[PDB]
């Protein structure tokens, strides 16, 4: 026999290549102007070329994936590009004379009215944002940080973003509802463009997250290993209603038009989120049931609040209407299992993406800021361990790539190489 080539053959090779973004047509066309989440990306096709494959089993591994790193890098570059045109706050780094406001007490207000001599001008700041110097006060990172303020016109909000592999590649998609995200996947479809991905920043919770069909899912590279995180995907999204009960005004102080917070209209109270108790209890029941399934019925599942470290991971950090709340979950995960009003605060100087580079200053938001969100994903860090006693699942996270990995858990980028050869009984004359 001899060898014959077959051009036009289904072949796969696991290779990584840069993918281009795709903004939804209604995302930009309808109303959004001057928002970071959308840019000159190519609009997606009206309907994706979703073709269902049969009798094929492909190996998936989100913990060795490359789309998550690619999308994290794209988000980093996009955020930096959005922040670049705005004017810096370098002259603002100066001694400030601060006195704490006593107009109203909720849980103290913690605000500080500070005067600075910019050749005496007053402004309002939060306690976490400013640190006393030895009364005299100074911005937390203005000495050794290129501090910057966001542009007043731009707004922070999730917007769907699709990823389409370039010509010559494909996105294998695991359609299996019961899929922990490792090893073989029984049902593998193929796409050109992925489903809607909303870049949302959050810790210990997944807001605007994609609900998972069937039951609640538990995912990790290594359940046994303590270090590896654990993703929890609920089947029923949980409502959260969070609001800051205060209204502020913006004062335009030229350095370069700096925007400073003004006095609050009437009462002053610390921000609060609300979550229904019964739905939380039911979701926790499903989660502990699945964790016991991964751990045995006799295992005892316990919960606890955060173990400390910085402030953007102990609490639940999220942006709402352009204001960055750091809302505690000290009380949500306080329950021992056997076989709620969240009081919270704001910080206008934020260190996004956990880097010591430029830190962005949150512009003030006028009026009461309220928002509803879909708690759909939990990030859990297994307790240490002494064996066969119990398990504790204090929330962790903070690594933004871990947040991305929940949305991109069911995709892999594959290179198709339709030039296979084969042997047969055929000889060229």
């Amino acid at each position: 026999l001899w060898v014959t080539v077959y051009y036009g053959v289904p072949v796969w090779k696991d290779a990584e290549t840069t993918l281009f973004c795709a903004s939804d047509a209604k995302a930009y066309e309808t109303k959004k102007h001057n928002v970071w989440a959308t840019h000159a990306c190519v609009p997606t096709d009206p309907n994706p070329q979703e073709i269902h494959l049969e009798n094929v089993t492909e190996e998936f591994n989100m913990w060795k994936n490359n789309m998550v790193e690619q999308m994290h890098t794209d988000i980093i570059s996009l955020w930096d590009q959005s922040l670049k045109p705005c004017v810096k706050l370098t002259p603002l780094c100066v001694t400030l004379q601060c006195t704490n406001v006593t107009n109203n007490i909720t849980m103290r207000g913690e605000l500080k009215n500070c005067s600075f001599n910019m050749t005496k001008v007053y402004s309002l700041f939060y306690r976490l944002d400013v640190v006393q110097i030895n009364k005299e006060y100074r911005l937390i990172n203005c000495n050794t940080s290129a501090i910057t303020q966001a542009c007043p016109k731009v707004s922070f909000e999730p917007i769907p973003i699709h990823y389409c592999a370039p010509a010559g590649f494909a996105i294998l998609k695991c359609k299996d509802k019961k899929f922990n995200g490792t090893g073989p996947c029984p049902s593998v479809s193929t796409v050109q463009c992925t489903h809607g991905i909303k870049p949302v920043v959050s810790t210990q919770l997944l807001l605007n997250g994609s609900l998972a069909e069937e039951e609640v899912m538990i995912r990790s590279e290594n359940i046994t290993n303590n270090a590896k995180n654990i993703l929890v995907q609920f089947n029923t999204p949980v409502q959260i209603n969070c609001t800051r009960p205060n209204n502020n005004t913006r004062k335009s102080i030229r350095i370069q038009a700096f925007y400073a917070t003004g006095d609050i209209i009437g009462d002053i109270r610390q921000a609060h989120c609300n979550v229904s108790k019964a739905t939380w209890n039911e979701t926790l029941g499903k989660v502990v049931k699945q964790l016991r399934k991964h751990f045995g019925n006799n295992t005892i599942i316990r919960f606890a609040n955060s173990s400390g470290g910085d402030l953007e991971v102990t609490t639940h950090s999220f942006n709402c209407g352009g204001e960055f709340f750091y809302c505690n979950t000290s009380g949500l995960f306080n329950s021992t299992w056997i076989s709620i009003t969240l009081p919270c605060r704001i910080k206008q100087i934020i260190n996004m993406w956990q880097r010591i580079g430029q830190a962005m200053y949150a512009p003030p938001i006028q009026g009461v800021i309220r928002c509803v969100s879909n708690i759909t994903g939990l990030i859990l860090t297994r307790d240490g361990g002494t064996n066969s006693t119990t398990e504790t699942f204090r929330p962790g996270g903070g690594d933004m790539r871990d947040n991305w990995r929940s949305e991109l858990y069911k995709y892999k980028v594959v290179k198709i190489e339709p030039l296979g050869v084969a042997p047969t009984r055929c000889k060229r004359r």
Partner: nanobody
Amino acid sequence: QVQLQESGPGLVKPSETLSLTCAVSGGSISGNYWSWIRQSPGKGLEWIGHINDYSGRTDYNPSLKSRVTISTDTSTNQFFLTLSSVSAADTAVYYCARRDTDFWRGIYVFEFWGQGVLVTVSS
């Protein structure tokens, strides 16, 4: 298992560029964080910088942001440190390390470390 081998001149005169090259074996295909750390004699350790060898964006210590530059090449799969305008106090043992991606409750640790290359500044 990732192995690290650092190399560079052992004697460097004051006030010129100092070059170190660290070669890594067995690292992940992408998303790695190659960090450079040093320890001055008679003093505690201090971080110098780190590179995301996929994105290419750097990061450095705030007190050394004007004197350091870290680069990386994927094809030969190595990364270089260039500390320009060296002074007399910069003599130290330099390590090239890899920090994880687990982020276990607000920490990044460098599991894999290099042997430790001496760098002494003298005339």
